[PDB]
DNA sequence: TTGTGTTGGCCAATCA
DNA sequence: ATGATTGGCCAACACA
């Protein structure tokens, strides 16, 4: 029964659980969107590093010439 | 007038828009999870490449030094 | 003003 | 029994 006290504490506690469950999921989804930003920046950095190292190797190999 | 006819049809339209909006959001999330796996594979490829070149450079520098 | 898209809350069923 | 999930729906508000 809606007027039942047990019912009331039930709804009160579930409303807290539901909000909590959904706030957690919103968090996880934002984290994933975040990882995409980090991985993208990091791959960009590493790619530039691949290019820097390649230049250093070419500069060294010119000494042979 | 939460008993009206205009009301019930307004509710129907919103409930449809809500399901559509939620499907779109969940799809977007699915795509993002995919983008992460993709970026992760690329990141590991780049890591190996940088390590490989660093060792190559190190070996080569050691050679010149040994002159 | 109106209509759709978003966001977040509630109820209830179901899982753990 | 209790907290976590999930899906249907309401309503305010953002966006056009």
Swiss-Prot record, chain B:
Expression triggers: By ER stress.
Compartments, as annotated in UniProt: Nucleus; Cytoplasm
Descriptive protein name: CCAAT/enhancer-binding protein beta
Cross-link Glycyl lysine isopeptide (Lys-Gly) (interchain with G-Cter in SUMO2) per UniProt, renumbered positions: 65
Quaternary structure (record): Binds DNA as a homodimer and as a heterodimer. Interacts with ATF4. Binds DNA as a heterodimer with ATF4. Interacts with MYB; within the complex, MYB and CEBPB bind to different promoter regions. Can form stable heterodimers with CEBPD. Can form stable heterodimers with CEBPA and CEBPE. Interacts with SIX1. Isoform 2 and isoform 3 also form heterodimers. Interacts with TRIM28 and PTGES2. Interacts with PRDM16. Interacts with CCDC85B. Forms a complex with THOC5. Interacts with ZNF638; this interaction increases transcriptional activation.
Region listing for Leucine-zipper, in residue ranges: 30-37
Tissue expression from the record: Expressed at low levels in the lung, kidney and spleen.
Encoding gene (name): CEBPB
Region (Basic motif): 8-28
Domain bZIP: 4-67
Location of this fragment in the whole protein: 268 to 334 of 345
Phosphoserine: residues bearing it: 21, 58
Protein family membership: Belongs to the bZIP family. C/EBP subfamily.
Known role: Important transcription factor regulating the expression of genes involved in immune and inflammatory responses. Also plays a significant role in adipogenesis, as well as in the gluconeogenic pathway, liver regeneration, and hematopoiesis. The consensus recognition site is 5'-T[TG]NNGNAA[TG]-3'. Its functional capacity is governed by protein interactions and post-translational protein modifications. During early embryogenesis, plays essential and redundant roles with CEBPA.
Domain remarks: The 9aaTAD motif is a transactivation domain present in a large number of yeast and animal transcription factors.
Entry PTM: Methylated.
């Amino acid at each position: 029964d809606k007027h039942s006290d047990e019912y009331k504490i039930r709804r009160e506690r579930n409303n807290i659980a539901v909000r909590k469950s959904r706030d957690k999921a919103k968090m996880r989804n934002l984290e994933t969107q975040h990882k995409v930003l980090e991985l993208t920046a990091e791959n960009e950095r590493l790619q530039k590093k691949v290019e820097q190292l390649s230049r250093e190797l070419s500069t060294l190999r010119n000494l042979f010439k």
